[PDB]
Design a protein around this ligand. Structure first.
Ligand SMILES: *[C@@H]1O[C@H](CO)[C@@H](O)[C@H](O)[C@H]1NC(C)=O
Lengths: 253, 35
C-alpha cells in the first residue's frame, strides 16, 4: 500500500495473508468470508506469463495477522487449503477479467477478537454503496513506495497497511487506460494522489461500511494496476457483487 | 457456507464495543460529500 497508514489492532479481522510454503514468501492478500471460505484474486493463484500455477499443497493462509513477519502466537491461525476454485472464464490473456478465486479451508477457523468474516454485498447494498465518489478501504502487506515499470512498489511494511480510496466513474476509468475494462471491474483512487494498492496487496479486500447497519461489506478485490502509486492513474478491482452468483454456486455445490 | 453469515462485518474490537477506528469517518463523509 502506497501512502497508507498502520492498521489498528483488529481493524481488519477478515484480512488473510496468502503464503507460499517453499520458499517462504508473502504471495497475496485475501479475505475471510466465513469460517471455511477465503476469497482472493485469480491472478494470485494462476498467471502463466509469470510461471504462476499453484496447487493447494503449495500454499497456506495466515489469518488474524498484524505484523508482516512475526509469528503472532495464539492470535494468528495458519490454515491449509482443501480446494482451489478459479473462475472458469477468468481472462488472464487480455485484461484479468473475472479475477476471482475461492479457497476452501481444510478445517474451519475459530473466530476471535482478531479473526472475523467480512459480509458479501447483496444487490441493494451494491446499488447503494458502489457509486462514484464513495470511498472504500483497502488493506495489505504490499510495498510502500511508487514504481513506474511494475505494480510491485518498493519497501516492505512491518505492519498491515490501510488506505481509503474513492470509487471512480466508469468513463474516467476507461479513459485512464488502454486496457479493455469490463463490467466485472471498477476502479478507485484520487488523480494527483499516490494512495494505491500494489502487487503484494493483490487479492485483498476493498471493503465499505454500510451507513445503515454498521456492517462491513467486501465490494471489491485488488486486481491490477499499471505501476503502483502513480499520479496519473487508478487501480482496478474485481466487482464482487457482479460475480456473486458464481461465488454462491461454488459454495452450494 | 459455514458459520459467519449472521454476524458478518461487525468487528469484535470496534462495532461490537461501540468504538470507531481512526479513519472510518472519512468513509461516511464520502457518502454525504462525495456525490
Ligand atoms: C497447472 O498445473 C499443471 C501444470 O503444471 C496442469 O495440471 C494444469 O494444466 C496447469 N494449468 C495451467 C493454467 O498451466
Amino acid at each position: 500500500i502506497v501512502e497508507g497508514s498502520d492498521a489498528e489492532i483488529g481493524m481488519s479481522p477478515w484480512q488473510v495473508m496468502l503464503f507460499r510454503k517453499s520458499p517462504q514468501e508473502l504471495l497475496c492478500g485475501a479475505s475471510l468470508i466465513s469460517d471455511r471460505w477465503v476469497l482472493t484474486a485469480a491472478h494470485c493463484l494462476l498467471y502463466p506469463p509469470w510461471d504462476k500455477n499453484f496447487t493447494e499443497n503449495d500454499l497456506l493462509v495466515r489469518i488474524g495477522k498484524h505484523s508482516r513477519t512475526r509469528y503472532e502466537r495464539n492470535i494468528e491461525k495458519i490454515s491449509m487449503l482443501e480446494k482451489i476454485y478459479i473462475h472458469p472464464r477468468y481472462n488472464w490473456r487480455e485484461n484479468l477479467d473475472r479475477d476471482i478465486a475461492l479457497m476452501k479451508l481444510k478445517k474451519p477457523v475459530a473466530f476471535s477478537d482478531y479473526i472475523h468474516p467480512v459480509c458479501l454485498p447483496d444487490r441493494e447494498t451494491a446499488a447503494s454503496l458502489l457509486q462514484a465518489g464513495y470511498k472504500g478501504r483497502v488493506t495489505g502487506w504490499g510495498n510502500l513506495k511508487e514504481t513506474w515499470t511494475a505494480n510491485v512498489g518498493k519497501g516492505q511494511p512491518s505492519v498491515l497497511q490501510v488506505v481509503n480510496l474513492p470509487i471512480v466513474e466508469r468513463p474516467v476509468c476507461k479513459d485512464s487506460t488502454r486496457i479493455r475494462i469490463t463490467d466485472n471491474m471498477f476502479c478507485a483512487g484520487i488523480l494527483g494522489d499516490r494512495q494505491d494498492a500494489c502487487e503484494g496487496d493483490s487479492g485483498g479486500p476493498f471493503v465499505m461500511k454500510s451507513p445503515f447497519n454498521n456492517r462491513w461489506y467486501q465490494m471489491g478485490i485488488v486486481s491490477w494496476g499499471e505501476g503502483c502509486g502513480l499520479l496519473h492513474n487508478y487501480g482496478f478491482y474485481t466487482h464482487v457483487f457482479r460475480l456473486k452468483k458464481w461465488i454462491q454456486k461454488v459454495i452450494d455445490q | 457456507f459455514g458459520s459467519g453469515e449472521a454476524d458478518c462485518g461487525l468487528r469484535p474490537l470496534f462495532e461490537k464495543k461501540s468504538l470507531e477506528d481512526k479513519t472510518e469517518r472519512e468513509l461516511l463523509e464520502s457518502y454525504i460529500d462525495g456525490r
